[PDB]
Amino acid sequence: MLDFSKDFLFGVATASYQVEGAYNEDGRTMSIWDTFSRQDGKVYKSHNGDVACDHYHLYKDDVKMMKDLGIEAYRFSIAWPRIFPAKGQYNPKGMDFYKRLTDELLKNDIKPFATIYHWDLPQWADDLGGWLNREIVEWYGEYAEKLFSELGGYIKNWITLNEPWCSSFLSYFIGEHAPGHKDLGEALLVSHNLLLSHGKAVEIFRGLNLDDSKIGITLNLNEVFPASDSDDDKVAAQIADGFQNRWFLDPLFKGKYPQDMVEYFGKYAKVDFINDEDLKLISQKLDFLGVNYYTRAVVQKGNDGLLDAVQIDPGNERTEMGWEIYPESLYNILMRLKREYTYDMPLYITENGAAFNDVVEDDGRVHDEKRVEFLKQHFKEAKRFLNDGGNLKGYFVWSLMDNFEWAHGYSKRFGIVYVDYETEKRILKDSALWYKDLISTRTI
Ligand code: NA
Ligand code: NA
Ligand code: NA
User: Fold this and answer.
1) Is 253 inside any structural domain?
2) Is residue 163 part of a domain?
3) Which residue of 36, 58, 70, 87 could cross-link 178, Cys pair, CB 3.0 to 4.6 Å?
4) Cα of 186 to ligand 3 centre, how many Å?
5) Which residues are tagged catalytic?
């Protein structure tokens, strides 16, 4: 009768540094991203999040806009540098923003999903070594415990980390993201300290025994296809799958790093951070897994160097990120989790969406028909997973609004709502009107 049950959550998602602005107001100190965006050549045209969408000031208009679309759940992140702008120094004015935001969501029948860490590490923590310093587990634990104690009556759905693959490999190996190191050993140790920090928050959360409250983690996952049936392309796909997916899924859900990748990485860097006590903390039972899905990878063996797979273009339609539009991988990844990792545990899609070349036409509208078709194809796969016995509880579109897309600055637009940055005007895109209809009819 309904493709999506009344209890299924239709959501949208943002992140603190990507939308809030007010970067130096009410006691906020710099994050690693405020620092990184001011380093020459790190971010497109030296864009930064000083102002972004001005969501800090415009949050009531943004909540009313979500209520008018019929949004059922809102995923956002909490900015560590607003809450602890200096080590051990709590900022009540910081916490007050997240109380007024969550109060506005609950009064407009929107369920809050709060990401504790979405990449805006305080500069003070980075200056003490940041994710390379195992003491960060205690600093993160103190931060998480404060959020649980102050906001536990406001928020019942908690996500420890967003995309630890990005905070580790993209930030410390590839160097695209803050703080922008280029060292495999650092990226591997950071991946471990991120997961241990997740573990510490889970341990704290369970000790609080919070009424009807749930905790999880968000991972960016893909599907890797070999370019051919050759043994060479099979190993290339195995390594690329180990690098993106299994390096995080295995410690979290099996309590062991993937042994093929430990051996592979061990040829190039130290993997001596692995121990039983830490893996027990990392693998504590979660209430749900958040999946961030955008695209697949088709790979062929490269020159036998470190993670040097050649990226094959299979000749299909792509977004403005150059990401293939391949909706079948959404179903394939959710089934893989049901069969191999999460079994009957609740899953959410915590991000899915696309960047297109959006323009405001002379009629004042944004006719983003490619984003309408993108979302339609991916929701149809979510429906297929549900109809095949999948435990999918909700789907959060990335993003509510166009925002600061990290190293790309404002040059990539992911919103269902267009933002004219000169005026901070919000314009509903045709994708927003399509989504409003999907929530209302629950039919696709
Ligand atoms: Na910002
Ligand atoms: Na800048
Ligand atoms: Na678990």
Assistant:
1) yes
2) yes
3) 36
4) 26
5) 163, 351
For the chain, first and last CA: distance in Å?
A: 12
Peptide bond into 179 cis (omega under 30): yes
Q: Residue 157 has which token pair?
A: 């759905």
Q: Which residues are annotated as a binding site for substrate?
A: 18, 118, 162, 294, 398, 405-406
Question: ∠ CA 151-90-60 to the nearest 5 degrees?
Answer: 45
> What CATH number is attached to the domain comprising 304?
3.20.20.80
Q: What is the DSSP letter of 48?
A: -
Nearest-angstrom CA–CA distance, 95 and 107: 18
Q: Which residues surround ligand 1, an ion (CB under 5 A)?
A: 17, 20-21, 49, 52
Asked if the structure places residue 134 within a domain, the reply is yes
Strand pairing class (9-13; 347-352): unpaired
Provide the residue range defining the domain that includes 79: 9-441
Considering every ligand atom, which ligand is closest to the CA of 28? 1
* Helix H or strand E segment including 234: helix 231-241
Of the candidates 91, 216, 219, the one whose C-alpha atom is nearest the C-alpha of residue 143 is 91
Count of the separate structural domains present in the chain: 1
